[PDB]
Amino acid sequence: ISAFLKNAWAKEPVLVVSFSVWGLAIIMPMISPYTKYASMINKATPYNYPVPVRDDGNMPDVPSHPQDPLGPSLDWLKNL
Amino acid sequence: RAEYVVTKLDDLINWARRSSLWPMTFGLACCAVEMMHMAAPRYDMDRFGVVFRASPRQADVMIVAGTLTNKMAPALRKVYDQMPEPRYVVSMGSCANGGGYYHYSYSVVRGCDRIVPVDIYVPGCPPTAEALLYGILQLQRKIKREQKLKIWYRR
Amino acid sequence: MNLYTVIFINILLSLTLILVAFWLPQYSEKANPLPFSMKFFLVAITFLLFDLEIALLLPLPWAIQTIKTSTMMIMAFILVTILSLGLAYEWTQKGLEW
Amino acid sequence: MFFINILTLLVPILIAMAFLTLVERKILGYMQLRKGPNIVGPYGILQPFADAMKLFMKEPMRPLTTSMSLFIIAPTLSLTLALSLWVPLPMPHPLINLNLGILFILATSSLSVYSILWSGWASNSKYSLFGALRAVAQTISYEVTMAIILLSVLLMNGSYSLQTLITTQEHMWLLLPAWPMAMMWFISTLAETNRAPFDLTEGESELVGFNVEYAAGPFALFFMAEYTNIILMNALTTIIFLGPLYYINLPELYSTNFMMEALLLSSTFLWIRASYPRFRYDQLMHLLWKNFLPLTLALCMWHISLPIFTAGVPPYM
Amino acid sequence: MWFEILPGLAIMGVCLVIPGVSTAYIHKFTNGGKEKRVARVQYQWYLMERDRRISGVNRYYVSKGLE
Amino acid sequence: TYKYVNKVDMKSATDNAARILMWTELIRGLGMTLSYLFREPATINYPFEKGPLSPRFRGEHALRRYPSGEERCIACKLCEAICPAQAITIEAEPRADGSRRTTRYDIDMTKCIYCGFCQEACPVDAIVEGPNFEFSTETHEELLYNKEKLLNNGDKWEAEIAANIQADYLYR
Amino acid sequence: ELVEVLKRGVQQVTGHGGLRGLLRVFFRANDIRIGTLVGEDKYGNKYYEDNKQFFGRHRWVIYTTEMNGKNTFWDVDGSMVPPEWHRWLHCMTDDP
Amino acid sequence: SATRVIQKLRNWASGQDLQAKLQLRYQEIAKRTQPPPKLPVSNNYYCTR
Amino acid sequence: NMTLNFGPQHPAAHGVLRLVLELSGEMVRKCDPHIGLLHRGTEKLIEYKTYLQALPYFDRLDYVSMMCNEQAYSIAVEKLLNIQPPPRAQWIRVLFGEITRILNHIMAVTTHALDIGAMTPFFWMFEEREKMFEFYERVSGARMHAAYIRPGGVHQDLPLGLLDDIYEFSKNFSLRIDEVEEMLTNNRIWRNRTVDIGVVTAEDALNYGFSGVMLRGSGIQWDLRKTQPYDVYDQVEFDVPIGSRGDCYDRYLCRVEEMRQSLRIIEQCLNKMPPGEIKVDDAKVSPPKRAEMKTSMESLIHHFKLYTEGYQVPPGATYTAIEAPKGEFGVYLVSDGSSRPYRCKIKAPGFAHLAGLDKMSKGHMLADVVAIIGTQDIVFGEIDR
Ligand SMILES: CCCCCCCCCCCCCCCCCC(=O)OC[C@H](COP(=O)(O)OCCN)OC(=O)CCCCCCCCCCCCCCCCC
Ligand SMILES: COC1=C(OC)C(=O)C(CC=C(C)C)=C(C)C1=O
Ligand code: SF4
Numbered sequence A: 001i002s003a004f005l006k007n008a009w010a011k012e013p014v015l016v017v018s019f020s021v022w023g024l025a026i027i028m029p030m031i032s033p034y035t036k037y038a039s040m041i042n043k044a045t046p047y048n049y050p051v052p053v054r055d056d057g058n059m060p061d062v063p064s065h066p067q068d069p070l071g072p073s074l075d076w077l078k079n080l
Numbered sequence B: 001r002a003e004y005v006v007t008k009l010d011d012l013i014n015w016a017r018r019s020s021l022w023p024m025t026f027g028l029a030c031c032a033v034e035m036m037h038m039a040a041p042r043y044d045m046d047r048f049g050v051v052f053r054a055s056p057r058q059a060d061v062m063i064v065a066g067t068l069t070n071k072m073a074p075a076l077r078k079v080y081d082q083m084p085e086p087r088y089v090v091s092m093g094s095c096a097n098g099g100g101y102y103h104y105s106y107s108v109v110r111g112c113d114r115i116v117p118v119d120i121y122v123p124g125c126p127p128t129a130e131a132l133l134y135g136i137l138q139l140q141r142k143i144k145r146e147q148k149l150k151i152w153y154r155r
Numbered sequence C: 001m002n003l004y005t006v007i008f009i010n011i012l013l014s015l016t017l018i019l020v021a022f023w024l025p026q027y028s029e030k031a032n033p034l035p036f037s038m039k040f041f042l043v044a045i046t047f048l049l050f051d052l053e054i055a056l057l058l059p060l061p062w063a064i065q066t067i068k069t070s071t072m073m074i075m076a077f078i079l080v081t082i083l084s085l086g087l088a089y090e091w092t093q094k095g096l097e098w
Numbered sequence D: 001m002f003f004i005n006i007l008t009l010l011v012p013i014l015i016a017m018a019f020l021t022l023v024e025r026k027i028l029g030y031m032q033l034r035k036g037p038n039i040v041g042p043y044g045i046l047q048p049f050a051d052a053m054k055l056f057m058k059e060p061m062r063p064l065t066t067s068m069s070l071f072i073i074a075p076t077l078s079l080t081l082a083l084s085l086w087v088p089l090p091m092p093h094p095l096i097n098l099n100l101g102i103l104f105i106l107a108t109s110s111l112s113v114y115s116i117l118w119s120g121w122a123s124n125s126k127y128s129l130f131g132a133l134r135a136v137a138q139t140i141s142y143e144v145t146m147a148i149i150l151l152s153v154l155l156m157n158g159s160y161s162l163q164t165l166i167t168t169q170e171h172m173w174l175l176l177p178a179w180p181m182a183m184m185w186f187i188s189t190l191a192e193t194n195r196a197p198f199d200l201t202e203g204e205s206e207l208v209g210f211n212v213e214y215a216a217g218p219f220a221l222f223f224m225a226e227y228t229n230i231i232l233m234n235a236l237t238t239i240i241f242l243g244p245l246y247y248i249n250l251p252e253l254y255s256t257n258f259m260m261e262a263l264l265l266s267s268t269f270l271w272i273r274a275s276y277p278r279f280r281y282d283q284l285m286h287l288l289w290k291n292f293l294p295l296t297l298a299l300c301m302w303h304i305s306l307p308i309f310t311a312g313v314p315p316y317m
Numbered sequence E: 001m002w003f004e005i006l007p008g009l010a011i012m013g014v015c016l017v018i019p020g021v022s023t024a025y026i027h028k029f030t031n032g033g034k035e036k037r038v039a040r041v042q043y044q045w046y047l048m049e050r051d052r053r054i055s056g057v058n059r060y061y062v063s064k065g066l067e
Numbered sequence F: 001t002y003k004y005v006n007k008v009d010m011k012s013a014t015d016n017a018a019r020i021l022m023w024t025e026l027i028r029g030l031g032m033t034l035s036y037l038f039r040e041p042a043t044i045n046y047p048f049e050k051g052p053l054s055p056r057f058r059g060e061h062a063l064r065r066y067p068s069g070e071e072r073c074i075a076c077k078l079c080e081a082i083c084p085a086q087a088i089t090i091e092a093e094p095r096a097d098g099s100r101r102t103t104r105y106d107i108d109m110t111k112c113i114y115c116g117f118c119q120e121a122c123p124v125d126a127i128v129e130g131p132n133f134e135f136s137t138e139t140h141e142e143l144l145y146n147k148e149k150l151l152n153n154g155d156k157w158e159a160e161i162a163a164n165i166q167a168d169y170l171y172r
Numbered sequence G: 001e002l003v004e005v006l007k008r009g010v011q012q013v014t015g016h017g018g019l020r021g022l023l024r025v026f027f028r029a030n031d032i033r034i035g036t037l038v039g040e041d042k043y044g045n046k047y048y049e050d051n052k053q054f055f056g057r058h059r060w061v062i063y064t065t066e067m068n069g070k071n072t073f074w075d076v077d078g079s080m081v082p083p084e085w086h087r088w089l090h091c092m093t094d095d096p
Numbered sequence H: 001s002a003t004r005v006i007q008k009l010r011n012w013a014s015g016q017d018l019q020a021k022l023q024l025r026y027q028e029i030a031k032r033t034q035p036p037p038k039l040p041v042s043n044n045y046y047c048t049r
Numbered sequence I: 001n002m003t004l005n006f007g008p009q010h011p012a013a014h015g016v017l018r019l020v021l022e023l024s025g026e027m028v029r030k031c032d033p034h035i036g037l038l039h040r041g042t043e044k045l046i047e048y049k050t051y052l053q054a055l056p057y058f059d060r061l062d063y064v065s066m067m068c069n070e071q072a073y074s075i076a077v078e079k080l081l082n083i084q085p086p087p088r089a090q091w092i093r094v095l096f097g098e099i100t101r102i103l104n105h106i107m108a109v110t111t112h113a114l115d116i117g118a119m120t121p122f123f124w125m126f127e128e129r130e131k132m133f134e135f136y137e138r139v140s141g142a143r144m145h146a147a148y149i150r151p152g153g154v155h156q157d158l159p160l161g162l163l164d165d166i167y168e169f170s171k172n173f174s175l176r177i178d179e180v181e182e183m184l185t186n187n188r189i190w191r192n193r194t195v196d197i198g199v200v201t202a203e204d205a206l207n208y209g210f211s212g213v214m215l216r217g218s219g220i221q222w223d224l225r226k227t228q229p230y231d232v233y234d235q236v237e238f239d240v241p242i243g244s245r246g247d248c249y250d251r252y253l254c255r256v257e258e259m260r261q262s263l264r265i266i267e268q269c270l271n272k273m274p275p276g277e278i279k280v281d282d283a284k285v286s287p288p289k290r291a292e293m294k295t296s297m298e299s300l301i302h303h304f305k306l307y308t309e310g311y312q313v314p315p316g317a318t319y320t321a322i323e324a325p326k327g328e329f330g331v332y333l334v335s336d337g338s339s340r341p342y343r344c345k346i347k348a349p350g351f352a353h354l355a356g357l358d359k360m361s362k363g364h365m366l367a368d369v370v371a372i373i374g375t376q377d378i379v380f381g382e383i384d385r
């Protein structure tokens, strides 16, 4: 099997690449340290406006002000 | 005045036609070979406007090189008849200008002119390539002299 | 608008140039000048079944920015693949062959 | 002053094309050791005006065509589209801004196919019909390889806007990420003009193609529209793959460097005409259906992953 | 020699930069000295229109904050 | 003696795929045509720099004349009996001096083949075949040369013919 | 290298007989190649010989503005050259 | 005679030595007017030959 | 199927052909080439013309090979007369025969390419062909149909500078061949267009009477310059370029090799050409020298009779074949005792080759046929005669 690839790399040297990159692209996402961020860098974009919720005093996390230390702070996207 | 305007304008019309003659050779020749050498590097014909040659519909001048035999005689007429009206014929060879080493044979037209009107006759068995170039240049002098617009004004 | 003006001007230029072409000039049999290409038809619907392929692949530019990026990737790969396997069958079928 | 723009957008491409007829006769010449035009002007600079002012004066013989309606709509369609694909071209400042620009260029490019179909069918002839059917096969087959190269590449600049390709290239040419795409793009721009080692149609030695029954004007236009998108599909390569400088200030530098690379890619096609024997109609297809299309589809799959795993998903807008 | 193919390109080398410089200065002269703003998404238009409302009928005109 | 004209380790297999995929072999042709636009064209300026010829160049016929002024042709008929295109008719008479000359001479230059069998047969060097090749004509009648379009023709190029005869006489 | 060719080119243009002289050559003869005048001729033709150029361009004629009733300024003719200089221009003999 | 750079352009692009084999004739050509020549011409009965 | 009559005017081939084709869709079902478009009657006219005044019929049979066509006739008329050309003349005919093979091959390889679509090889080589014409013009007087290889010798001696100029051309020509060599031999595009197209098997090639590079391309060993030597080829050394896989490419490669092998033969001819006279000098066969006819009566009588009447070759018939660049060119000259021939059957390498087009171009598309005619090097003068 391994020496059959040798003529298929000498002659037919196209379909080899096309079935070597067809796949390579299926394994790069499953094995990369940085694939988690694509659904996150794309999740941070505030395209529409963030509606604020009414305060009850029962919500400690919700950052009261845009500059509170609380809330979704992305010091990640920076120097991702 | 009006006469001067239509003298200058056909001078323009004539310059365009003679500057760019696109010729289609009838091959069928020993003369065709020589014609090729006119298209070749030594005496580039393109430099004179003539092109490395195009097809019948887009051809301004037909160069009949070589004997026009009786079986090819109907074909030369239809190709001549399939060209745009501003259209001219240069007859290369001493075998298209009349007969040739092969003159009196049961199968040879004595001059392609018989089939189609001829404008410049280039003489020579293999008219030397320069010759044909002189003949094409002579067509350009014939095309400069033509005064179609003046004749319409003087109608 | 501007696009209209342009595309329209582009037409007028085209027409004029054929207007002048048929009028500037101002019989002789001058005018005198088939089996089925089954291969061609095949090639043609091969292109139809593939052009529509692109039409389903053009959303990628705007789906890459979907939250479920993992889902897009998966959905796309299958399309590109199932279409490649189709082409591949054609190959074996020799339909691609001319 | 919008009309001043069209007048300074169509004159400077019909006056350029004209001198590509010249430049396609000299560069080919000196390779053939033969000077091109030298005489009508100083160095042939005045030859296209001659055969421009000449072809139009030859009888536009409607040769017993089946339908003039087509014979005289096909040649106009062509120059109409070709001179339109320039309207959204992404110069530092495009005549018109069109989101979906690259689609526009793709779509309009496609319509051209008709010119081949209509012209061939109208002019009754074996050669005409033969060439057309065969020619469009090529054109259509190459659209499917252009689109993907076009699509794939998009994932990288992340929008269909030509005008963003310039930004995506603010610091690098996309030739280096995608030279495989740029190879097959070059052939899909060189063979979708029915041009080059690939001139199956207008097969001249074998076929006398569709434009055969055309002459004088009707021909000129078909021609004018083959050299006015011989400059597009190189002008795109100078936008999509070869990214010249763009500075908010000095907005000419881009156009100047756009010049320097579009003439090479317009002068690179000229080495081809003078270098490659023509592909045979079967081989051309097998080049796309069994070699390019596979590589194109796989690399498209590669480019949809590259953003996700490199987390480089381009910014919409 | 090959010196001569240049006269030809020279014209196709200016015939091709006349368009890129032209379109990019008939914009900076028909948009008040500033690039023609690009309205790609609804929000850009709104802002543009808003501007027209704020001063003259022309987007290009701009209110510095003294208005 | 006969010669045959057209008769895998990864190193070789990669090399083959580096010449099929990243085409490197059509490039050795593009550089080959790039090697020629930078050379000097061979084209001669035609009308001003006519190409090179030889004193042997066979073109437009002409009837040489003795320096005294006496036509050299003595109507032998040794030059239509050989002219294969059957082009020459030289009906003659005694010229009323008692001498022997043509009243008729002819070439139909639309039948001649420029073979020079008439210049090598002439025992007197009367008929030659000059180095003209710019004598194209707009009509058919201007090619049926008579004795007076060949004799004043030979009264034109005799400065240019004799140099070539004297240049090639030994080899002939 | 590139320094030398431009100096040689500007020389030819200015010394080909002047601006009008240049135009009458560049625009009637398409030639600016300076060459030794082998000899002027009746009718006013001009013959030049530059042996450094290749075998086709080392012998060129520069025709008259006009000759007899010819008006041969724009109408340059192949047979205009006299029989005397055909033996040389076509290089059948080196002898001027 | 061409600028060395331009000609090295043609030697490198061609891959072959090109100053040596010129397709143009400069001094390679024999000059015309070659000196006149003298071509070379008992029991010579034709019945024997 | 669809009867598309390939153009008689069509730019492809040699423009004197019809080739009615049946188009089974894209592929061509059958070809029925209709030659006759250039039958001038060459063989009829020769019967009415003396042996000297018929030589010209021959350089105009295959106008690409001028002096080799003549070399056949000249060999045929010599054999009928039992006279042989002088030693210098035989070398000159071999020198000119090899220059014609280079020029025929430059014609065949470059014109095949422009049919295929490669345009530059033709221009580079055609300038090299104008240099070679000049050699014909500087020995005969014409650039074509020179009529120089006459019965008994060549008509006139070589001019004093020809052999030096032939050395300078041959010295640099080899680079010009491989310059075309690099352009077309390895290109993907050329090999695909030419390789495995029009394969002809060895026995079929002999049966169809191919007799040329078409015979040698399929691997059959036969040149006619080494099998049945003529002139002085027996004294010059060369290698026949045979080939396997009889396909257009192998046939192209063979034609490029013969150009190279001909430079080897031209090299020997310049190195070893003997001092001597150029025509047999029994005045009965070859005309007397210009000085002799003007000073000695026997020479005037012999000049008058030879030019006016003729050689009067003894009654007999001969078929003499020489390896013309296209293939075996043979003249079957039947002769009565008269000065003018009785029959002259010109065997044209080409009448046989074009017959093979239908068999060779089977299972092939329209484009392949353009290559099939190109690889037969057919010029219709020889076929039509
Ligand atoms: C590992 C990292 C992650 C993965 C990265 C991606 C995987 C690796 C990718 C490697 C890509 C290698 C190159 C692939 C694209 C090149 C096109 C191609 O695949 O070749 C097809 C074809 C081959 O021809 P052939 O020998 O007949 O092969 C088929 C045999 N049945 O080729 C041809 O014959 C086409 C010939 C057409 C005529 C060409 C004429 C010359 C053109 C010169 C262009 C010069 C400018 C090019 C650049 C332009 C830039 C805008
Ligand atoms: C294939 O190469 C050739 C051409 O290019 C396609 C020609 O135009 C021409 C000229 C065209 C015609 C119609 C005579 C010839 C002769 C030729 O051999
Ligand atoms: S004229 Fe002389 S050369 Fe031209 S074809 Fe007839 S024979 Fe051959």
Ligand code: SF4
Pocket: F072, F073, F074, F075, F076, F077, F078, F079, F080, F090, F121, F122, F123, F124, F125, F126, F127
């Ligand atoms: S020309 Fe010479 S040959 Fe012919 S007749 Fe007069 S003399 Fe006799």
Ligand code: SF4
Pocket: F082, F083, F084, F085, F086, F087, F088, F107, F111, F112, F113, F114, F115, F116, F117, F118, F119, F129
């Ligand atoms: S040249 Fe040959 S053909 Fe012409 S006339 Fe003299 S002999 Fe007769």
